[PDB]
Each structure stands twice: as structure tokens, then as C-alpha cells.
Design a protein around this ligand. Structure first.
Ligand SMILES: Fc1ccc([C@H]2NCCc3[nH]cnc32)cc1
Ligand SMILES: Fc1ccc([C@H]2NCCc3[nH]cnc32)cc1
Lengths: 320, 320
């Protein structure tokens, strides 16, 4: 309870708890087994002198690999997380553009990005450490799957600091989790080989593998992630979406290489026509193409309706 | 950028930054000057090997006591933080009760607490560490005065763990900052003695002393705090307000000893009549008495209107 006592304990209980998590759940320690033994002794030493600090929730009382379960507790998104209106025909996308060119004039360019057919995940970083990950839920509230998301190889626990782009104080970033096709099939064979039913498609597999009461199951599966939107942010004010991606890259978040910037509708349509013909070559499932006004100020003059942003639209291919 | 590298740096940059803050701003280190020198060497060592990790925002680049200023940046409250309707006459408080007894029947008891005439402060603890403090603003958004609140002796940086009450994951707690009368006068003399104008009353003094661009000014002043409400909480579901105070005590947050629990209106009125006669004996300013329905479930069946809770009311004395 004395101030240095409490700073010491938290910092060490946090460090050992992490390591417990990486060893047991993710089967991937980042320190030796020896170093870890130093750490846990110290925290039990320190808990010896001050028995206020041994609680049922202490890393020293969650010893094997216990205390690591997901329960999907409702958790609020910082910002709304709405779902995207859809366009299925050349006329609707044109109509969307017309409307968009009638409000924020000719200052709006269009970021074009591949729509992945996986599970939306919202992640929150507080001063460069990953604090929360949740599912969409209803847009305002989703479910806590933080432990499962911590096993996804693509999801750094901590953001990488660099000269050009300082780590925000708060960063809420949205992305899609998905399986590569070759891994979807390999997981299905492994499951059948245990007497378990296989998944009918990669989306269900990713959703199923994300939503595991026991996150060690998720850590055994080769789930992936690609960031594709920002929610609430502090200490970060990017002027465009395409430039925010550069910062995300820099901090170590996964971002797609099939994003292009288009000037006017005609550019948009070539990208849609292009990926209509070549999407089958991406190693993961592509639904369509999400067209967004790239300029953030224009993404405020245009707003969102109660259910969907007015500055973006998902063009969806017909399947077959 | 390797995982243990980033965990190491953050944990150490966080530890030295704190210590810098306590030494320079608060003039109150909690470790020796020697220990601190060990810490800062290490972080500069570690920053030597990995020059990714020396940024303009690193404790090793904010060396004297720099980088510690308040700028009042807007920050959102987790939960709404509304202001309390007022009652000035026996008839209005009766009317309020009648209405309250007509909706949640005779199951509602009334917590009665002294209304302090100071500055509302909302604090946010994330797993037992103080993350944010802000002013009321408009109820939804207030101003970031986190550094100033970190100097208030009454505000633990970290919550104390105990058997009976586990530290919530998130705790947003509201309270009032204020001066004792003897310290309001002493501060006024010290200011006049420097050629500065004195404050006309203790509330303005507390508000002024809280809102300092340079938090070291706040640390020099004997500001106090008393918690008196909960906003958003996670890992904490108290059945009543009076029992939530017990947990707050236990975790080390300051709470008032003049809170009483009343059964029916008649009890409420004796407390108001009592403090009408004895408030002048409290060493700080008392406005009135805030009457709240103590049962949290009844604090949901009754809700809040767009501007004020329906389950509470501040009775205000006439001044003189
Ligand atoms: F009896 C043991 C043996 C090994 C450990 C290790 N498992 C915890 C975290 C970690 N990190 C690196 N090794 C370890 C714990 C208890
Ligand atoms: F040149 C110096 C001398 C002393 C310090 C100390 N000031 C920083 C934090 C702290 N904590 C305990 N002592 C110190 C820093 C630089």
C-alpha cells in the first residue's frame, strides 16, 4: 500500500502475468524459463512482506495456466463502429457518387480497398499497449475476446515507436480476421481427424476459432488480421485515410497491399472491374471493394446516419 | 521492436516517467535519488542498443522536469456525468419523494450526504492505476487535468487490493475537490505576499488551483478530494451506493464520514434540519445535502432524464 510498494507489485504482476500468458496460452515465451523463475520468486518475496498484495486474482495464485478464459462480456466501443451500406450495381455506385459529389464538391478522392469476408474485430491500444479487442456486437457494444486476439500473430501486443509517427495515447483500430484458404482446409482436416465436424466456409472457421472460451485453442490456429479503419483516436490526427495506413504500418499493424487511391468515379470503376477479374488470385476471400472518401475533413462534413457512414460504401460482387 | 524489447522499454519508461513526475512536479520522490539513477541509466543503455526506442517523447528526452504541462484537451467521460436537480423548500423535497415513492414503491432508502461547494472531478482507474481525471465540461466531455489531480494528496495513484473487495477492471469515480477554510486563507496570504490577487472564495480557489497549465503549482496547494458517486465500472457490481463507498474506502479513495442512510422521508428531513444547524462546524464549505436512492437497481428502474438523474436530488440551504 505504500506508494513504491504498489508501483512495484503492479509492474511485476503485470510482467509475470504476461509471461504466464505467452508461455501457457500462446505456447511462445519471449524470455527464458530461467529469467521467468527470477521474476516469480521476487513477486512472491514482495507478497511475503506485504500480505495485502496476495489476492485470489494475483499471478502467484493463477499458477499453472489458470485464470485465462474468455467469457464474451459486453464491452463498449469508444466510437460507434457502424456497418457499411452496400452497392450491387453500376447504377447504385454511380448514384452514391453523384450524391457524394454534390455535397463535398470535387475535393473528395476515393480510397479503394478489398473487402475481406471475415470477422470484424475492434482493437484498442492505450499508449501503445493493446488493452481490449472486441467484436462488433450491435455497433455500440460488442464482446470481449481480448485474450483470443492476443494470440493472433498479426496483432502486436505493443505498437512500435518511430520518428515519423508518434504512438497515439488512445488508438481504436478496426480490422478483419480471416483464414487463408490453405489454412482453412488444413484446420478442417485436423478437426475431422479428432472426430470434430469441419467448417463449411473460411468465415465461419475464423469466427469459430476467434470465439473460444479457452484462448489456447485460438492460439493453435493460424488466424490473420488486416486493419481497415480507425475508430476513436487520441494523439493522432491524420488528414487522410491513406496516410493513416502509413502510420499503422509504421507502428506495426497489419495493413493490406491492395489499397489504391482513386481520383473520381471512373478510377473507382476500373478497380472494381479489375478485382472482378483477379480477386480469385488473392489467397483469402474477397467479397468486393470498399470505397471511402479519403479526406477526413470531408468525412465530417459528410457524416453518418443512425446506421451507416455516408462517406463510404461497399461494392459487392455477385458470388456465382 | 522484438516483443521482450518493447515490453521492457515501456515498463521502464513508465517507471522512470513516474518518478520524474513525483520528483519534479510533486517534489516528493518515493525512491531514493540513487535508485532512480540506476533506472535512467538502464533505459538509456537499452535505448543505445535499439535506437528505434529514443523518440522526442521518451523520458530520456524530457529530462529536467520538462514535458509535464496541462492543456485541458477535451476528453470524454465513460458515462454521462449529469448535474443534479435542486430542491429549495420542504414542499419540493416532499414532491420529489412522493414521485419517488410512486414509482419504485417502498423499497427505496435514501443515502444522505453533505453537498460540498467545490469543483467536480471525474477520475478513471484502469486495473487499479489512475489513467485520467477530468472536469465536468458539458457532461459528456470535460477537460483533461490528469497531471494536476495526480498531485492531490487524497488521490492515490493506485488502488489498494484487499480480500473483501477486488480491484475493478475499470472504475470511473466522481468526487469534489475543495479547500479547507484554514488553507484557503493561508493560500490567499501567500499569494498577496507575491503580489498576486487573492481569491474571493474557496470554490474559486480550488478551481483556480486545479486548472494550472503547470501542475507543480497545484502540487504546492493543499487541495482535497471526497468521492461521492460512481460513473462507468467494470469488475464491480455493488448492490447499493452505501456499500460501494465501503469498497472505495477499502481501495483507498477518500470518502466522507457524514453520510447517513435514511429510511423514508422523515429521516431525510431530520438530516437536513440537523446539518442546517451544524454545517458551520465542518472545516469546509457545505451547500446542502444530496439525497439519493441507495439501491442501484432502483437507480435503473428510475432513470435519468436528458439532463439530470431522476433518483437523486440536492437540497440547498439558503446562504444568509
Ligand atoms: F513450473 C514452471 C515452469 C515454467 C514456467 C514458465 N511458464 C510460465 C511463464 C514462462 N515464461 C518462460 N517460461 C515460463 C512456469 C512454471
Ligand atoms: F540530475 C538529477 C538528479 C536527481 C534526479 C531525481 N529526479 C528525477 C526522479 C527522481 N526520483 C528520485 N530522485 C530523482 C534526476 C536528475
Amino acid at each position: 500500500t505504500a506508494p513504491e510498494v504498489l508501483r512495484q507489485w503492479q509492474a511485476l504482476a503485470e510482467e509475470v502475468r504476461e509471461h504466464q500468458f505467452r508461455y501457457y496460452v500462446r505456447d511462445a515465451p519471449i524470455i527464458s524459463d530461467a529469467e521467468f523463475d527470477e521474476l516469480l520468486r521476487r513477486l512472491e518475496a514482495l507478497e511475503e512482506q506485504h500480505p495485502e498484495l496476495r489476492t485470489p486474482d494475483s499471478p502467484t495464485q493463477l499458477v499453472g495456466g489458470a485464470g485465462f478464459a474468455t467469457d464474451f462480456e459486453p464491452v463498449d466501443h469508444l466510437e460507434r463502429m457502424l456497418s457499411l451500406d452496400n452497392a450491387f450495381t453500376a447504377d447504385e455506385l454511380a448514384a452514391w457518387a453523384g450524391r457524394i459529389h454534390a455535397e463535398v464538391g470535387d475535393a473528395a478522392h476515393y480510397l479503394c480497398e478489398l473487402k475481406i469476408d471475415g470477422v470484424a474485430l475492434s482493437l484498442v491500444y492505450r499508449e501503445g499497449r493493446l488493452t481490449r479487442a472486441s467484436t462488433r456486437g450491435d455497433g455500440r457494444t460488442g464482446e470481449d475476446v481480448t485474450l483470443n486476439a492476443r494470440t493472433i500473430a498479426d496483432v502486436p501486443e505493443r505498437l512500435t515507436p518511430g520518428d515519423d509517427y508518434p504512438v497515439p495515447e488512445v488508438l481504436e483500430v478496426r480490422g478483419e480476421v480471416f483464414f487463408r484458404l490453405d489454412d482453412f482446409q488444413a484446420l478442417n482436416a485436423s478437426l475431422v481427424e479428432e472426430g470434430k465436424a469441419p467448417f463449411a466456409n473460411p468465415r465461419n472457421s475464423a469466427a469459430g476459432s476467434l470465439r473460444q472460451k479457452d484462448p489456447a485453442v485460438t492460439a493453435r490456429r493460424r488466424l490473420r488480421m488486416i486493419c481497415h479503419g480507425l475508430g476513436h483516436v487520441e494523439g493522432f490526427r491524420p488528414a487522410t485515410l491513406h496516410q493513416a495506413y502509413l502510420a499503422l504500418r509504421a507502428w506495426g499493424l497489419p495493413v493490406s497491399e491492395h489499397t489504391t487511391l482513386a481520383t473520381d468515379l471512373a478510377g473507382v470503376r476500373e478497380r472494381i472491374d479489375y478485382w472482378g477479374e483477379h480477386r480469385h488470385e488473392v489467397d483469402h476471400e474477397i467479397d468486393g471493394v470498399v470505397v471511402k472518401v479519403d479526406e477526413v475533413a470531408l468525412q465530417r462534413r459528410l457524416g453518418s446516419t443512425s446506421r451507416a457512414p455516408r462517406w463510404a460504401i461497399a461494392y459487392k460482387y455477385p458470388p456465382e
